[PDB]
Design an enzyme around this catalytic site. Structure first.
Site, PDB file in Angstrom:
ATOM      1  N   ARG A 161     -15.424  10.649  -0.388  1.00 22.82           N
ATOM      2  CA  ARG A 161     -14.557  10.925  -1.535  1.00 22.82           C
ATOM      3  C   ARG A 161     -14.788   9.796  -2.522  1.00 22.82           C
ATOM      4  O   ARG A 161     -14.088   9.648  -3.523  1.00 22.82           O
ATOM      5  CB  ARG A 161     -13.086  10.937  -1.127  1.00 22.82           C
ATOM      6  CG  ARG A 161     -12.592  12.234  -0.521  1.00 22.82           C
ATOM      7  CD  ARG A 161     -12.627  12.205   0.987  1.00 22.82           C
ATOM      8  NE  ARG A 161     -11.819  11.113   1.523  1.00 22.82           N
ATOM      9  CZ  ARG A 161     -10.489  11.047   1.470  1.00 22.82           C
ATOM     10  NH1 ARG A 161      -9.785  12.024   0.904  1.00 22.82           N
ATOM     11  NH2 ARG A 161      -9.860   9.996   1.993  1.00 22.82           N
ATOM     12  N   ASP A 171       0.957   2.862   3.698  1.00 23.42           N
ATOM     13  CA  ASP A 171       0.234   3.943   3.051  1.00 23.42           C
ATOM     14  C   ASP A 171       1.228   5.069   2.891  1.00 23.42           C
ATOM     15  O   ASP A 171       0.924   6.233   3.109  1.00 23.42           O
ATOM     16  CB  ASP A 171      -0.960   4.409   3.881  1.00 23.42           C
ATOM     17  CG  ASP A 171      -1.831   5.396   3.121  1.00 23.42           C
ATOM     18  OD1 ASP A 171      -1.933   5.243   1.884  1.00 23.42           O
ATOM     19  OD2 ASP A 171      -2.411   6.312   3.744  1.00 23.42           O
ATOM     20  N   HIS A 216      -7.077   0.114   5.853  1.00 20.90           N
ATOM     21  CA  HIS A 216      -7.373   1.206   6.776  1.00 20.90           C
ATOM     22  C   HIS A 216      -8.383   0.795   7.853  1.00 20.90           C
ATOM     23  O   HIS A 216      -8.918   1.644   8.557  1.00 20.90           O
ATOM     24  CB  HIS A 216      -7.952   2.418   6.027  1.00 20.90           C
ATOM     25  CG  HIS A 216      -7.059   2.964   4.955  1.00 20.90           C
ATOM     26  ND1 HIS A 216      -5.752   3.327   5.189  1.00 20.90           N
ATOM     27  CD2 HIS A 216      -7.306   3.253   3.656  1.00 20.90           C
ATOM     28  CE1 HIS A 216      -5.232   3.822   4.079  1.00 20.90           C
ATOM     29  NE2 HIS A 216      -6.153   3.789   3.133  1.00 20.90           N
ATOM     30  N   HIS A 265       0.818  -1.201   0.000  1.00 21.12           N
ATOM     31  CA  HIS A 265       0.000   0.000   0.000  1.00 21.12           C
ATOM     32  C   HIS A 265       0.855   1.254   0.000  1.00 21.12           C
ATOM     33  O   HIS A 265       0.973   1.935   1.014  1.00 21.12           O
ATOM     34  CB  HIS A 265      -0.909   0.017   1.223  1.00 21.12           C
ATOM     35  CG  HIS A 265      -2.148   0.830   1.035  1.00 21.12           C
ATOM     36  ND1 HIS A 265      -3.170   0.441   0.199  1.00 21.12           N
ATOM     37  CD2 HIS A 265      -2.526   2.016   1.564  1.00 21.12           C
ATOM     38  CE1 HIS A 265      -4.125   1.353   0.220  1.00 21.12           C
ATOM     39  NE2 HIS A 265      -3.758   2.319   1.042  1.00 21.12           N
ATOM     40  N   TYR A 303      -9.622   5.456  -6.168  1.00 22.02           N
ATOM     41  CA  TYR A 303     -10.869   5.601  -5.417  1.00 22.02           C
ATOM     42  C   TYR A 303     -12.098   5.537  -6.318  1.00 22.02           C
ATOM     43  O   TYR A 303     -13.092   4.889  -5.980  1.00 22.02           O
ATOM     44  CB  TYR A 303     -10.954   6.956  -4.729  1.00 22.02           C
ATOM     45  CG  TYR A 303     -10.301   7.112  -3.384  1.00 22.02           C
ATOM     46  CD1 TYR A 303     -10.876   7.935  -2.429  1.00 22.02           C
ATOM     47  CD2 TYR A 303      -9.079   6.523  -3.093  1.00 22.02           C
ATOM     48  CE1 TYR A 303     -10.253   8.174  -1.218  1.00 22.02           C
ATOM     49  CE2 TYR A 303      -8.434   6.760  -1.877  1.00 22.02           C
ATOM     50  CZ  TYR A 303      -9.029   7.589  -0.945  1.00 22.02           C
ATOM     51  OH  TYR A 303      -8.404   7.855   0.249  1.00 22.02           O
ATOM     52  N   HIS A 326       1.825   4.869  -2.291  1.00 21.13           N
ATOM     53  CA  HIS A 326       1.533   5.804  -3.368  1.00 21.13           C
ATOM     54  C   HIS A 326       2.791   6.168  -4.143  1.00 21.13           C
ATOM     55  O   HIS A 326       3.130   7.336  -4.286  1.00 21.13           O
ATOM     56  CB  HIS A 326       0.894   7.049  -2.773  1.00 21.13           C
ATOM     57  CG  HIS A 326      -0.464   6.795  -2.212  1.00 21.13           C
ATOM     58  ND1 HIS A 326      -1.577   6.647  -3.008  1.00 21.13           N
ATOM     59  CD2 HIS A 326      -0.875   6.559  -0.944  1.00 21.13           C
ATOM     60  CE1 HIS A 326      -2.614   6.324  -2.259  1.00 21.13           C
ATOM     61  NE2 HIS A 326      -2.215   6.263  -1.001  1.00 21.13           N
ATOM     62  N   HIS A 375     -10.585   0.948  -0.039  1.00 21.55           N
ATOM     63  CA  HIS A 375     -10.220   2.024   0.871  1.00 21.55           C
ATOM     64  C   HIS A 375     -11.450   2.168   1.733  1.00 21.55           C
ATOM     65  O   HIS A 375     -12.566   2.232   1.216  1.00 21.55           O
ATOM     66  CB  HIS A 375      -9.997   3.340   0.126  1.00 21.55           C
ATOM     67  CG  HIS A 375     -10.174   4.561   0.984  1.00 21.55           C
ATOM     68  ND1 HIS A 375      -9.228   4.980   1.893  1.00 21.55           N
ATOM     69  CD2 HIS A 375     -11.194   5.450   1.075  1.00 21.55           C
ATOM     70  CE1 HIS A 375      -9.652   6.076   2.500  1.00 21.55           C
ATOM     71  NE2 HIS A 375     -10.842   6.383   2.020  1.00 21.55           N
ATOM     72  N   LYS A 422      -8.119  -1.213  -7.265  1.00 22.28           N
ATOM     73  CA  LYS A 422      -8.402  -0.542  -6.013  1.00 22.28           C
ATOM     74  C   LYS A 422      -9.613   0.334  -6.179  1.00 22.28           C
ATOM     75  O   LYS A 422      -9.881   0.830  -7.267  1.00 22.28           O
ATOM     76  CB  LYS A 422      -7.238   0.335  -5.579  1.00 22.28           C
ATOM     77  CG  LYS A 422      -7.456   0.934  -4.207  1.00 22.28           C
ATOM     78  CD  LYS A 422      -6.690   2.214  -4.007  1.00 22.28           C
ATOM     79  CE  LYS A 422      -6.985   2.766  -2.634  1.00 22.28           C
ATOM     80  NZ  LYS A 422      -6.316   4.036  -2.382  1.00 22.28           N
TER      81      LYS A 422
HETATM   82  C1  LIG Z   1      -6.608   7.268   7.933  1.00 20.16           C
HETATM   83  C2  LIG Z   1      -6.677   8.716   7.364  1.00 20.16           C
HETATM   84  C3  LIG Z   1      -6.056   9.675   8.450  1.00 20.16           C
HETATM   85  C4  LIG Z   1      -5.869   8.920   6.018  1.00 20.16           C
HETATM   86  C5  LIG Z   1      -6.305   8.100   4.750  1.00 20.16           C
HETATM   87  C6  LIG Z   1      -5.113   7.915   3.757  1.00 20.16           C
HETATM   88  P1  LIG Z   1      -5.428   7.552   1.973  1.00 20.16           P
HETATM   89  O1  LIG Z   1      -6.853   6.894   1.747  1.00 20.16           O
HETATM   90  O2  LIG Z   1      -4.408   6.551   1.599  1.00 20.16           O
HETATM   91  C7  LIG Z   1      -5.162   8.973   0.809  1.00 20.16           C
HETATM   92  N1  LIG Z   1      -4.213   9.852   1.516  1.00 20.16           N
HETATM   93  C8  LIG Z   1      -4.544   8.523  -0.549  1.00 20.16           C
HETATM   94  C9  LIG Z   1      -4.300   9.662  -1.487  1.00 20.16           C
HETATM   95  O3  LIG Z   1      -3.308  10.352  -1.381  1.00 20.16           O
HETATM   96  O4  LIG Z   1      -5.233   9.866  -2.414  1.00 20.16           O
HETATM   97  C10 LIG Z   1      -7.447   8.855   4.092  1.00 20.16           C
HETATM   98  O5  LIG Z   1      -7.255   9.704   3.205  1.00 20.16           O
HETATM   99  O6  LIG Z   1      -8.683   8.529   4.545  1.00 20.16           O
HETATM  100 ZN   LIG Z   2      -7.368   5.004   1.315  1.00 24.79          ZN
HETATM  101 ZN   LIG Z   3      -3.758   4.890   0.378  1.00 24.53          ZN
END
Ligand SMILES: CC(C)C[C@H](CP(=O)(O)[C@@H](N)CC(=O)O)C(=O)O
Ligand SMILES: [Zn+2]
Ligand SMILES: [Zn+2]
Length: 388
Positions: A169, A285, A230, A68, A137, A70, A201, A162
Protein backbone atom coordinates in the site's frame (compact mmCIF):
# COMPACT_ATOMS: atom_id res chain seq x y z
CA UNK A 1 -13.77 36.23 53.08
CA UNK A 2 -11.53 36.00 49.99
CA UNK A 3 -11.81 33.59 47.06
CA UNK A 4 -9.04 31.33 45.71
CA UNK A 5 -11.09 29.14 43.34
CA UNK A 6 -9.37 30.08 40.08
CA UNK A 7 -6.29 28.38 41.42
CA UNK A 8 -8.22 25.11 41.48
CA UNK A 9 -6.13 23.48 44.20
CA UNK A 10 -6.05 19.70 44.54
CA UNK A 11 -4.44 17.51 47.20
CA UNK A 12 -4.20 13.90 45.99
CA UNK A 13 -2.96 11.95 49.03
CA UNK A 14 -2.04 8.59 50.48
CA UNK A 15 -1.53 6.83 47.15
CA UNK A 16 1.29 4.48 46.18
CA UNK A 17 3.06 6.65 43.65
CA UNK A 18 4.82 5.33 40.54
CA UNK A 19 6.13 8.41 38.74
CA UNK A 20 6.94 5.85 37.02
CA UNK A 21 9.76 5.38 39.52
CA UNK A 22 8.43 3.53 42.55
CA UNK A 23 8.20 6.52 44.93
CA UNK A 24 6.44 4.68 47.73
CA UNK A 25 3.39 6.14 49.45
CA UNK A 26 3.36 9.94 49.09
CA UNK A 27 1.13 12.87 48.08
CA UNK A 28 0.83 15.16 45.04
CA UNK A 29 -0.36 18.79 45.24
CA UNK A 30 -1.91 20.05 42.03
CA UNK A 31 -2.67 23.67 41.24
CA UNK A 32 -3.44 25.36 37.89
CA UNK A 33 -3.29 22.00 36.15
CA UNK A 34 0.30 21.68 37.25
CA UNK A 35 2.03 19.42 39.72
CA UNK A 36 3.42 21.88 42.24
CA UNK A 37 4.57 19.48 44.93
CA UNK A 38 5.48 15.83 45.51
CA UNK A 39 6.46 14.53 48.94
CA UNK A 40 4.79 12.49 51.65
CA UNK A 41 2.38 14.13 54.09
CA UNK A 42 1.59 17.45 52.48
CA UNK A 43 -0.58 19.30 55.04
CA UNK A 44 -4.27 19.10 54.14
CA UNK A 45 -4.49 22.81 54.92
CA UNK A 46 -1.27 24.06 53.33
CA UNK A 47 -3.43 26.10 50.90
CA UNK A 48 -6.96 27.55 50.75
CA UNK A 49 -9.98 26.11 48.95
CA UNK A 50 -7.96 22.96 48.38
CA UNK A 51 -9.76 19.79 47.34
CA UNK A 52 -8.48 16.61 48.96
CA UNK A 53 -8.96 13.20 47.40
CA UNK A 54 -8.60 10.27 49.79
CA UNK A 55 -6.73 8.02 47.39
CA UNK A 56 -5.43 5.92 50.26
CA UNK A 57 -5.18 2.34 49.04
CA UNK A 58 -5.09 3.13 45.32
CA UNK A 59 -2.14 3.57 42.95
CA UNK A 60 -1.28 6.79 41.18
CA UNK A 61 0.78 7.04 37.98
CA UNK A 62 1.25 9.18 34.84
CA UNK A 63 -1.39 9.19 32.14
CA UNK A 64 -0.69 7.43 28.85
CA UNK A 65 0.91 8.88 25.74
CA UNK A 66 -0.51 7.15 22.66
CA UNK A 67 1.68 8.18 19.75
CA UNK A 68 -0.36 6.42 17.10
CA UNK A 69 -4.04 7.19 16.81
CA UNK A 70 -6.19 7.85 13.73
CA UNK A 71 -8.02 10.71 15.45
CA UNK A 72 -10.20 11.52 12.43
CA UNK A 73 -10.65 8.00 11.21
CA UNK A 74 -9.00 5.52 8.91
CA UNK A 75 -9.52 2.32 6.97
CA UNK A 76 -10.86 2.39 3.43
CA UNK A 77 -8.90 -0.64 2.22
CA UNK A 78 -12.12 -2.39 1.27
CA UNK A 79 -14.20 0.36 -0.24
CA UNK A 80 -15.78 3.51 1.29
CA UNK A 81 -17.78 1.37 3.69
CA UNK A 82 -14.62 0.57 5.64
CA UNK A 83 -13.90 4.17 6.67
CA UNK A 84 -13.65 3.98 10.48
CA UNK A 85 -15.13 6.95 12.34
CA UNK A 86 -13.32 9.52 14.46
CA UNK A 87 -12.39 8.93 18.08
CA UNK A 88 -14.46 10.30 20.97
CA UNK A 89 -12.76 12.16 23.77
CA UNK A 90 -14.31 9.68 26.19
CA UNK A 91 -12.95 6.41 24.85
CA UNK A 92 -9.50 7.99 25.18
CA UNK A 93 -9.52 9.28 28.74
CA UNK A 94 -11.61 6.30 29.75
CA UNK A 95 -8.68 4.25 28.44
CA UNK A 96 -5.99 6.06 30.39
CA UNK A 97 -4.78 8.10 27.45
CA UNK A 98 -4.12 11.76 28.22
CA UNK A 99 -1.68 12.61 25.46
CA UNK A 100 -2.05 11.46 21.91
CA UNK A 101 -0.28 11.91 18.58
CA UNK A 102 -2.54 11.48 15.57
CA UNK A 103 -1.71 10.45 12.01
CA UNK A 104 -3.38 9.44 8.72
CA UNK A 105 -3.00 6.16 6.94
CA UNK A 106 -3.53 4.49 3.61
CA UNK A 107 -6.31 6.93 2.57
CA UNK A 108 -5.03 10.43 1.71
CA UNK A 109 -7.69 11.05 -0.90
CA UNK A 110 -10.75 11.18 1.34
CA UNK A 111 -8.82 12.14 4.50
CA UNK A 112 -6.80 15.38 4.65
CA UNK A 113 -4.28 16.60 7.22
CA UNK A 114 -6.23 19.84 7.47
CA UNK A 115 -9.10 18.03 9.16
CA UNK A 116 -6.72 16.06 11.39
CA UNK A 117 -5.19 19.31 12.66
CA UNK A 118 -8.72 20.39 13.46
CA UNK A 119 -9.67 17.38 15.61
CA UNK A 120 -6.25 17.68 17.17
CA UNK A 121 -7.01 21.22 18.24
CA UNK A 122 -10.49 20.19 19.28
CA UNK A 123 -9.22 17.38 21.50
CA UNK A 124 -6.98 20.01 23.12
CA UNK A 125 -9.80 22.41 23.87
CA UNK A 126 -11.90 19.63 25.35
CA UNK A 127 -9.22 18.57 27.81
CA UNK A 128 -6.46 16.18 26.80
CA UNK A 129 -3.28 17.08 24.88
CA UNK A 130 -2.86 16.23 21.19
CA UNK A 131 -0.25 16.47 18.44
CA UNK A 132 -0.24 15.22 14.86
CA UNK A 133 2.06 13.86 12.15
CA UNK A 134 2.03 15.44 8.66
CA UNK A 135 1.36 13.35 5.53
CA UNK A 136 0.41 9.63 5.52
CA UNK A 137 1.42 6.34 3.84
CA UNK A 138 1.89 8.12 0.49
CA UNK A 139 5.34 9.39 -0.42
CA UNK A 140 5.92 12.07 -1.60
CA UNK A 141 4.06 13.26 1.45
CA UNK A 142 0.76 15.09 1.07
CA UNK A 143 1.21 18.10 3.35
CA UNK A 144 -0.69 21.15 4.53
CA UNK A 145 1.61 23.90 3.23
CA UNK A 146 3.28 21.91 0.47
CA UNK A 147 6.51 21.09 2.29
CA UNK A 148 7.16 18.48 4.95
CA UNK A 149 9.81 20.87 6.16
CA UNK A 150 7.49 23.87 6.17
CA UNK A 151 4.70 21.88 7.80
CA UNK A 152 6.81 20.71 10.75
CA UNK A 153 8.40 24.14 11.09
CA UNK A 154 5.27 26.28 11.17
CA UNK A 155 2.04 24.36 12.02
CA UNK A 156 2.21 24.20 15.82
CA UNK A 157 0.66 20.77 16.33
CA UNK A 158 2.83 19.01 13.75
CA UNK A 159 5.79 17.24 15.34
CA UNK A 160 6.88 14.93 12.54
CA UNK A 161 5.95 13.13 9.35
CA UNK A 162 4.60 9.69 8.62
CA UNK A 163 5.15 7.38 5.70
CA UNK A 164 4.78 3.75 4.79
CA UNK A 165 7.38 1.30 3.51
CA UNK A 166 7.62 -2.44 2.84
CA UNK A 167 3.88 -2.84 2.42
CA UNK A 168 1.65 -3.40 -0.62
CA UNK A 169 0.00 0.00 0.00
CA UNK A 170 3.18 1.99 -0.20
CA UNK A 171 3.58 4.35 -3.12
CA UNK A 172 6.77 2.43 -3.91
CA UNK A 173 9.04 5.29 -2.76
CA UNK A 174 12.76 5.17 -3.47
CA UNK A 175 15.81 5.88 -1.33
CA UNK A 176 15.97 9.53 -2.39
CA UNK A 177 12.32 10.56 -1.85
CA UNK A 178 12.40 8.74 1.46
CA UNK A 179 15.63 10.40 2.53
CA UNK A 180 14.61 13.86 1.39
CA UNK A 181 11.37 13.59 3.32
CA UNK A 182 13.14 12.34 6.45
CA UNK A 183 15.47 15.32 6.38
CA UNK A 184 12.85 18.01 5.84
CA UNK A 185 11.11 16.84 8.99
CA UNK A 186 14.35 16.93 10.99
CA UNK A 187 15.22 20.50 10.05
CA UNK A 188 11.57 21.44 10.34
CA UNK A 189 11.75 20.15 13.86
CA UNK A 190 14.92 22.15 14.45
CA UNK A 191 13.29 25.37 13.36
CA UNK A 192 9.93 24.90 15.05
CA UNK A 193 11.01 23.20 18.25
CA UNK A 194 9.36 19.93 17.35
CA UNK A 195 10.95 16.45 17.61
CA UNK A 196 11.19 16.15 13.84
CA UNK A 197 10.48 12.45 13.80
CA UNK A 198 9.71 10.20 10.83
CA UNK A 199 7.36 7.36 11.73
CA UNK A 200 7.51 4.40 9.34
CA UNK A 201 4.50 2.13 8.89
CA UNK A 202 5.91 -1.34 8.46
CA UNK A 203 4.56 -4.17 6.33
CA UNK A 204 4.78 -7.94 5.97
CA UNK A 205 7.17 -7.35 3.04
CA UNK A 206 10.16 -9.66 2.81
CA UNK A 207 12.43 -6.61 2.50
CA UNK A 208 11.66 -5.73 6.11
CA UNK A 209 13.73 -2.77 7.45
CA UNK A 210 16.03 -2.59 4.41
CA UNK A 211 14.73 0.89 3.33
CA UNK A 212 15.75 2.37 6.68
CA UNK A 213 19.27 0.92 6.65
CA UNK A 214 19.50 2.21 3.08
CA UNK A 215 18.23 5.66 4.03
CA UNK A 216 20.84 5.87 6.79
CA UNK A 217 23.53 5.28 4.17
CA UNK A 218 22.08 7.95 1.88
CA UNK A 219 21.90 10.84 4.35
CA UNK A 220 22.86 12.16 7.76
CA UNK A 221 19.63 12.15 9.70
CA UNK A 222 20.15 10.92 13.29
CA UNK A 223 18.93 7.35 13.75
CA UNK A 224 17.27 8.74 16.88
CA UNK A 225 14.65 10.26 14.59
CA UNK A 226 13.58 7.14 12.69
CA UNK A 227 10.69 5.24 14.29
CA UNK A 228 9.56 1.88 12.86
CA UNK A 229 6.02 1.13 14.09
CA UNK A 230 4.02 -2.10 13.95
CA UNK A 231 7.33 -3.94 14.36
CA UNK A 232 5.53 -6.90 15.93
CA UNK A 233 3.50 -7.75 12.81
CA UNK A 234 5.81 -10.60 11.70
CA UNK A 235 8.70 -12.56 13.22
CA UNK A 236 11.51 -11.83 10.77
CA UNK A 237 10.75 -8.09 11.07
CA UNK A 238 10.58 -8.02 14.86
CA UNK A 239 14.04 -9.57 14.99
CA UNK A 240 15.46 -6.90 12.70
CA UNK A 241 13.67 -4.33 14.81
CA UNK A 242 15.68 -5.44 17.83
CA UNK A 243 18.86 -5.23 15.80
CA UNK A 244 17.77 -1.69 14.81
CA UNK A 245 17.17 -0.97 18.46
CA UNK A 246 20.61 -2.29 19.37
CA UNK A 247 22.19 0.24 17.01
CA UNK A 248 20.56 2.99 19.05
CA UNK A 249 17.10 3.34 17.55
CA UNK A 250 13.69 3.41 19.22
CA UNK A 251 10.97 0.94 18.13
CA UNK A 252 7.20 1.37 18.38
CA UNK A 253 5.20 -1.78 19.20
CA UNK A 254 1.51 -1.84 18.30
CA UNK A 255 -0.65 -3.31 21.05
CA UNK A 256 -3.49 -4.07 18.67
CA UNK A 257 -1.68 -7.05 17.09
CA UNK A 258 -1.96 -10.22 19.19
CA UNK A 259 0.14 -12.57 17.03
CA UNK A 260 2.72 -13.78 15.89
CA UNK A 261 4.46 -11.68 18.55
CA UNK A 262 2.36 -10.37 21.43
CA UNK A 263 2.90 -6.80 22.60
CA UNK A 264 3.69 -8.02 26.10
CA UNK A 265 5.91 -10.80 24.69
CA UNK A 266 7.47 -8.29 22.34
CA UNK A 267 8.50 -5.79 24.99
CA UNK A 268 9.94 -8.42 27.34
CA UNK A 269 11.87 -10.08 24.55
CA UNK A 270 13.52 -6.71 23.84
CA UNK A 271 14.67 -6.17 27.40
CA UNK A 272 16.08 -9.69 27.56
CA UNK A 273 17.78 -8.78 24.29
CA UNK A 274 19.50 -5.92 26.09
CA UNK A 275 17.66 -2.90 24.72
CA UNK A 276 16.89 -0.31 27.33
CA UNK A 277 13.23 0.50 27.91
CA UNK A 278 13.69 4.12 26.86
CA UNK A 279 13.92 2.84 23.29
CA UNK A 280 10.76 0.78 23.44
CA UNK A 281 7.32 2.32 23.19
CA UNK A 282 3.83 0.90 22.90
CA UNK A 283 1.30 2.53 20.56
CA UNK A 284 -2.36 1.52 20.09
CA UNK A 285 -3.23 2.38 16.51
CA UNK A 286 -6.67 3.34 17.70
CA UNK A 287 -9.65 3.54 15.35
CA UNK A 288 -7.40 2.22 12.61
CA UNK A 289 -8.37 -0.74 10.45
CA UNK A 290 -7.23 -4.31 11.11
CA UNK A 291 -7.27 -5.63 7.54
CA UNK A 292 -5.57 -8.86 6.62
CA UNK A 293 -4.41 -10.10 3.21
CA UNK A 294 -3.79 -13.58 1.76
CA UNK A 295 -1.09 -14.25 -0.85
CA UNK A 296 -2.47 -12.44 -3.91
CA UNK A 297 -2.96 -9.19 -2.02
CA UNK A 298 -6.63 -10.01 -1.46
CA UNK A 299 -8.33 -8.52 1.58
CA UNK A 300 -10.18 -11.20 3.53
CA UNK A 301 -11.22 -9.68 6.87
CA UNK A 302 -11.31 -6.14 8.27
CA UNK A 303 -12.25 -4.45 11.53
CA UNK A 304 -11.38 -1.71 14.00
CA UNK A 305 -8.69 -1.39 16.65
CA UNK A 306 -9.66 -0.25 20.12
CA UNK A 307 -7.67 1.14 23.02
CA UNK A 308 -8.41 -1.51 25.64
CA UNK A 309 -5.19 -3.22 24.55
CA UNK A 310 -2.89 -0.63 26.13
CA UNK A 311 -3.66 -1.35 29.79
CA UNK A 312 -3.96 -5.07 29.07
CA UNK A 313 -0.33 -5.22 27.94
CA UNK A 314 0.70 -3.42 31.10
CA UNK A 315 -1.22 -5.97 33.21
CA UNK A 316 0.15 -8.88 31.18
CA UNK A 317 3.58 -7.49 31.96
CA UNK A 318 3.42 -7.32 35.74
CA UNK A 319 1.95 -10.81 35.76
CA UNK A 320 3.18 -13.42 33.29
CA UNK A 321 6.41 -11.78 32.47
CA UNK A 322 7.36 -10.90 35.98
CA UNK A 323 7.99 -7.16 35.50
CA UNK A 324 7.66 -4.31 37.96
CA UNK A 325 4.60 -2.06 37.83
CA UNK A 326 7.27 0.60 37.25
CA UNK A 327 9.22 -0.77 34.26
CA UNK A 328 5.88 -1.89 32.79
CA UNK A 329 4.55 1.65 32.80
CA UNK A 330 7.53 3.23 31.05
CA UNK A 331 6.72 2.19 27.45
CA UNK A 332 3.54 4.28 27.49
CA UNK A 333 4.81 7.14 29.57
CA UNK A 334 8.42 8.22 30.16
CA UNK A 335 9.76 6.44 27.12
CA UNK A 336 7.33 8.02 24.68
CA UNK A 337 7.68 11.37 26.41
CA UNK A 338 11.41 11.25 25.80
CA UNK A 339 11.32 10.21 22.17
CA UNK A 340 8.94 12.98 21.11
CA UNK A 341 10.43 15.49 23.52
CA UNK A 342 7.03 16.20 25.06
CA UNK A 343 7.64 18.40 28.12
CA UNK A 344 5.32 18.41 31.13
CA UNK A 345 4.46 14.84 30.13
CA UNK A 346 5.54 11.32 31.01
CA UNK A 347 6.79 11.98 34.53
CA UNK A 348 5.17 13.02 37.81
CA UNK A 349 7.27 15.69 39.47
CA UNK A 350 7.01 19.44 40.23
CA UNK A 351 6.49 21.40 37.04
CA UNK A 352 4.79 18.86 34.80
CA UNK A 353 1.13 18.57 33.85
CA UNK A 354 -1.39 16.90 36.14
CA UNK A 355 -1.95 14.02 33.77
CA UNK A 356 -2.76 11.39 36.36
CA UNK A 357 -4.37 7.97 36.59
CA UNK A 358 -5.78 6.36 39.71
CA UNK A 359 -5.96 2.55 39.55
CA UNK A 360 -6.68 -0.30 41.98
CA UNK A 361 -3.79 -2.45 43.17
CA UNK A 362 -4.86 -4.85 40.45
CA UNK A 363 -4.35 -2.14 37.82
CA UNK A 364 -7.93 -1.20 36.93
CA UNK A 365 -8.47 2.45 36.00
CA UNK A 366 -10.76 4.25 38.46
CA UNK A 367 -9.93 7.93 37.92
CA UNK A 368 -8.21 9.95 35.22
CA UNK A 369 -7.04 13.51 35.67
CA UNK A 370 -6.12 15.43 32.55
CA UNK A 371 -4.11 18.57 33.07
CA UNK A 372 -6.06 18.89 36.31
CA UNK A 373 -9.66 18.49 35.17
CA UNK A 374 -11.28 15.28 36.36
CA UNK A 375 -12.09 13.31 33.20
CA UNK A 376 -12.91 9.81 34.44
CA UNK A 377 -14.60 8.69 37.63
CA UNK A 378 -15.25 5.22 39.03
CA UNK A 379 -14.14 3.71 35.74
CA UNK A 380 -16.60 5.58 33.54
CA UNK A 381 -15.88 8.88 31.80
CA UNK A 382 -17.58 11.88 33.42
CA UNK A 383 -16.58 14.30 30.67
CA UNK A 384 -17.45 13.36 27.08
CA UNK A 385 -16.83 15.23 23.83
CA UNK A 386 -19.06 18.01 22.55
CA UNK A 387 -21.29 15.87 20.38
CA UNK A 388 -20.93 12.31 21.75
C1 LIG B 1 -1.03 -5.03 11.82
C2 LIG B 1 -2.18 -5.04 10.77
C3 LIG B 1 -3.19 -6.18 11.19
C4 LIG B 1 -2.99 -3.69 10.68
C5 LIG B 1 -2.22 -2.38 10.25
C6 LIG B 1 -2.92 -1.10 10.79
P1 LIG B 1 -2.65 0.54 9.99
O1 LIG B 1 -1.28 0.58 9.19
O2 LIG B 1 -2.54 1.50 11.10
C7 LIG B 1 -4.04 1.16 8.94
N1 LIG B 1 -5.24 0.48 9.48
C8 LIG B 1 -4.23 2.70 9.05
C9 LIG B 1 -5.37 3.22 8.23
O3 LIG B 1 -6.51 3.15 8.64
O4 LIG B 1 -5.05 3.72 7.03
C10 LIG B 1 -2.17 -2.37 8.73
O5 LIG B 1 -3.05 -1.82 8.04
O6 LIG B 1 -1.10 -3.00 8.18
ZN1 LIG C 1 0.46 1.48 9.62
ZN1 LIG D 1 -1.79 3.35 11.93
Amino acid sequence: MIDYTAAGFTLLQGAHLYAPEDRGICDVLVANGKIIAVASNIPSDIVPNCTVVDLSGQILCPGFIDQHVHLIGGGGEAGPTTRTPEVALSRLTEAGVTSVVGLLGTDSISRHPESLLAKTRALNEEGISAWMLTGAYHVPSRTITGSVEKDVAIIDRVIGVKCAISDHRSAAPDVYHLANMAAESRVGGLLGGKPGVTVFHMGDSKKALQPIYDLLENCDVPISKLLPTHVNRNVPLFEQALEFARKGGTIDITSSIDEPVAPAEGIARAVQAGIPLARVTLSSDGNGSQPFFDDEGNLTHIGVAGFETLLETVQVLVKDYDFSISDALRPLTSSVAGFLNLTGKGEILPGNDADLLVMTPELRIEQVYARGKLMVKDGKACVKGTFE
